[PDB]
Design a binder for this molecule. Structure first.
Ligand code: VE1
Length: 454
């Protein structure tokens, strides 16, 4: 069975949620379902990346980093896949996976996902991970324009797995309060988490009669894309995809053009693994706690239509979009594969202020925040052969990320960007530097005030 078609290579960059969906061209598109979510904190990615920036690695730091990272990441991915999970996105500090099933089956699936989580820690019993799990209703949002598509999962189950994540320490498996209350408590031994309603999993103690293999196989009954039969030994049914122009047209909208060129063998397969000077523009769009997903979707769509238009003007791209706690965030980048223009820093700032101005006027968006940082960041395809994504990793990525969170409502920039721009000082304001989660001495942080006082 020949399986190396372009459509198959494109599908490697996408979850089954997108590959095997069949939904309208309307944007935004929204769908609703139930499932179990898994968030694997891999940090040790942004910790290690800056070790490989040193001269000890003799200009092969990027190639060495992608190698060892994929070694560990791909092992996590294999575990997720063989347990029936769907890896939704990679984000440098973690991956998010989904077990979509009917509500009546969440109880049994939570057990599958807990066993999966425990075997993932088994792979690493320095290098360790933290796992959060949640279960309940999930909303999917698809937004984009006629040639680009993006997706997000939204809902309390998403926010639940967010908070379960941040409690875990190395080797921990934290269950969301709803996950704990929907799970098979007769089989899961838990313990308190101080003044948090989540719980930590200590042991999986099944009845004397219980055989997980038989249990798991019956659970696969409910998995609408688990490989079986002649394809029992495939990690993804997506590997069996055959040419289909209409489907490929839809799927390629989700993938960055430079990635498509590699998939088409018009670019060296190692061209995208690099430690590169870029400028990160991290945009955050905060909505109110009361907002429903049906209001958030149209707002993100309207925001995105402007963001992409400005990014193309100033020659930037969207690398990642996230959402948790009513904040939708766009990881934008300037200066990656063929986009290194001489005045990158000035354009990043003006693009940021432009995005800030417009999105601040979109209804239902209560606050816009943008952090800008410039420096060496790792760029590469991270994951497994069958499931991988282009991702940027580095401390300047994390700095832009916390800038937009710790300095809401304004456009902030780092000292590199400030000094390097061909703009005068009064366009800026030096800021009170704040204690920021796992961030070194930033250097001076600045607000991009603009060309006028008003
Ligand atoms: C690797 N990764 C990180 C995130 C952001 C996130 C979501 C939930 C809890 C967290 F702690 C962090 C996502 C993600 C993917 C999709 Cl499809 N939708 C949304 N909303 N987020 N992927």
């Amino acid at each position: 069975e020949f399986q190396d078609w372009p459509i198959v290579r494109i599908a490697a960059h996408l979850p089954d949620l997108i590959v095997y969906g069949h939904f309208s061209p309307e944007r935004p598109f929204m769908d609703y379902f139930d499932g179990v979510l898994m968030f694997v904190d891999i940090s040790g990615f942004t910790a290690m990346t800056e070790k490989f920036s040193s001269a000890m690695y003799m200009d092969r730091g990027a190639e060495q980093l992608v190698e060892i990272l994929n070694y560990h990441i791909s092992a996590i991915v294999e575990k997720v896949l063989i347990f029936g999970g769907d890896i939704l996105k990679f984000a440098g500090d973690a991956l998010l996976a989904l077990w979509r099933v009917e509500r009546k089956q969440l109880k049994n699936i939570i057990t599958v996902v807990i066993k999966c989580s425990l075997e993932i820690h088994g792979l690493f019993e320095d290098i360790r991970v933290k796992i959060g799990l949640a279960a309940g209703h999930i909303s999917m949002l698809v937004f984009g324009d006629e040639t680009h598509s993006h997706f997000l999962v939204i809902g309390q189950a998403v926010d639940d797995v967010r908070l379960a994540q941040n409690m875990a320490q190395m080797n921990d498996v934290i269950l969301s309060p709803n996950c704990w209350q929907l799970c098979d408590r007769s089989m899961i031994e838990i313990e308190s988490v101080p003044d948090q309603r989540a719980v930590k999993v200590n042991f999986l103690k099944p009845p004397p009669n219980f055989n997980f293999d038989e249990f798991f196989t019956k659970c696969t009954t409910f998995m609408h894309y688990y490989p079986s039969g002649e394809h029992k030994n495939l990690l993804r049914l997506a590997c069996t995809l055959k040419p289909d122009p209409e489907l490929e047209m839809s799927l390629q909208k989700y993938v960055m053009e430079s990635i498509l060129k590699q998939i088409d063998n018009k670019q060296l397969q190692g061209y995208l693994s690099e430690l590169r000077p870029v400028t990160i523009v991290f945009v955050n769009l905060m909505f109110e706690d009361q907002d429903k997903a049906e209001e958030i979707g149209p707002a993100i769509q309207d925001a995105y239509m402007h963001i992409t238009s400005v990014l193309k003007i100033f020659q930037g791209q969207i690398n990642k979009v996230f959402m948790f706690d009513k904040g939708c965030s766009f990881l934008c980048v300037f200066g990656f594969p063929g986009e290194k223009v001489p005045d990158e820093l000035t354009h990043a700032l003006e693009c940021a202020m432009d995005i800030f101005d417009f999105c601040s006027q979109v209804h239902k968006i209560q606050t816009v925040s943008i952090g800008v940082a410039s420096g060496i960041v790792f760029c590469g395809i991270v994951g497994h052969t069958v499931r991988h994504e282009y991702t940027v990793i580095g401390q300047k990525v994390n700095l832009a990320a916390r800038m937009m969170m710790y300095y809401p409502g304004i456009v902030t920039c780092d000292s590199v960007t400030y000094n390097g721009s061909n703009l005068p000082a009064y366009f800026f304001k030096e800021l009170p530097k704040k204690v920021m989660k796992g961030v070194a001495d930033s250097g001076p942080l600045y607000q991009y005030w603009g060309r006028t006082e008003k």
